[PDB]
Design a protein around this nucleic acid. Sequence first.
DNA 1: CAACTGATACCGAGAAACC
DNA 2: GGTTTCTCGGTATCAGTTG
Lengths: 105, 108
Amino acid sequence: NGKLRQWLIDQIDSGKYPGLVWENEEKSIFRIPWKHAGKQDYNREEDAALFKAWALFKGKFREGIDKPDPPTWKRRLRCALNKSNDFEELVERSSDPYKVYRIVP
Amino acid sequence: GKLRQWLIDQIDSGKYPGLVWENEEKSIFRIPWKHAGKQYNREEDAALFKAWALFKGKFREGIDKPDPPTWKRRLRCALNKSNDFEELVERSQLDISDPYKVYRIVPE
DNA sequence: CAACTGATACCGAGAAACC
DNA sequence: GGTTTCTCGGTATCAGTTG
């Protein structure tokens, strides 16, 4: 139970994802890159990495077993972030597009 | 456990399309497992889940608001957890038009 | 129907709530 | 002690939009 919140915090603190950064000292709001896969500025490795990391973490994707599908990984994390009460996107603040999310206690 | 019989009675009834026996031994059956849209036979397909909530007194006409999603859910959570039935995943078919799941009645 | 979306239907694991 | 429902935290499909 409650794997998403802790996992995403760990992924931000990890520093393995460029653009996945905190935006205040309290570690309560963060920015998340949201590049479109069609556009040219879409570096496949770096812009799909966090979604692939969430599919791997939950066992939905297994390397060398299943066909990669970045669009499904993207949709899975978005649907999860919308559903979860722990996160709330701040829309008035969302070439390098992104989203901003606040963590609620 | 009123489920295990309740179900053979509804199969032998045949009051539900897509809900058939698979052998003359009365031991393996199909149960339709369609995904709702926004509504396309929203009452023919919901009949079994309605029947189950009516039976177990979870839905009394004129007292509760109808709710197809939770009628199918309850019946499905019951069938999967039940010990009187097992699913034959190798024969289930969730990738066709008019899809279904196949179960076996274990004797006891 | 490529990628993407919100809204909604759906699912399984415990945790109750019944029987 | 034995079945069925309830909770919860996600995941999947629908009916479109290009977010």
